[PDB]
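User: I'm writing a short report section on ligand binding and want a predicted complex to refer to. Could you take this sequence and 93W and write out the structure as tokens? A short remark afterwards would be nice.
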Amino acid sequence: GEYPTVNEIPVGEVRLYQIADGVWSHIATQSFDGAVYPSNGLIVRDGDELLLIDTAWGAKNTAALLAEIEKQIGLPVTRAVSTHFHDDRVGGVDVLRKAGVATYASPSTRRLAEAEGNEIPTHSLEGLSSSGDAVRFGPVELFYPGAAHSTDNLVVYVPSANVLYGGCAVLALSRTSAGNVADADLAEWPTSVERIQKHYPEAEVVIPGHGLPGGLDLLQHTANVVTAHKN
Ligand SMILES: O=C(N[C@H](Cc1c[nH]c2ccccc12)C(=O)O)c1nc(Cl)c2ccccc2c1O
Ligand SMILES: [F-]
Ligand SMILES: [F-]
Ligand SMILES: [Zn+2]
Ligand SMILES: [Zn+2]
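Assistant: Sure. The structure tokens for the complex follow:
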């Protein structure tokens, strides 16, 4: 297996969950402002190498992530993309870089990470500055849906498996709150979700930044939660 939940993962350990052939999520837990949350990222096979989407929310968790990948999959992570500037996405980038992983993020994400005092991916991803932009990166498509959870948030689609990784722009079905909205655009977020809905109508699995994967319902649910919050 079942998808692991927060109480099943001690802080510092990482689980992998097979989503499709050559596609896994990674699940970690971290303490933030005195509460513990689970957090997801993605791993996508690209021949005899792996592409990583997002860190495991901190240096120690990300070291544990690399160890778990080596144990379970046995292929090297050669590139990583961070989908927004918050620490659940970039915290651990230094561990990755020092391990030889080429780390990437949009210029917006890199600027915001630097201003926040967070770790900074090495390389810039151009072609993603306008809402609706899409670029190919190894075995995935990167898509900028517009401002949502943050102004820089990206989503990731795996065409070969019809897997949509929504990152923090997409909420799990059990979420009742938009959560940390300090950097969010609640007015635009439903429109950004609609852009995702329209661009990936064939998605079979949708993975949120935190919590359980599901189907396309997670997209509409997200728009509903964020609109109810704003209201
Ligand atoms: O209030 C939140 N969540 C509650 C609980 C919840 C339900 N389902 C969940 C699935 C995963 C994590 C929390 C949940 C909800 O929406 O009812 C909340 N969630 C996350 Cl992630 C946060 C991350 C970073 C900073 C603050 C956060 C936050 O406030
Ligand atoms: F986040
Ligand atoms: F996120
Ligand atoms: Zn965030
Ligand atoms: Zn909360």
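A remark for your report: The chain has one domain: 1-231. DSSP finds six helices and twelve strands in the chain.
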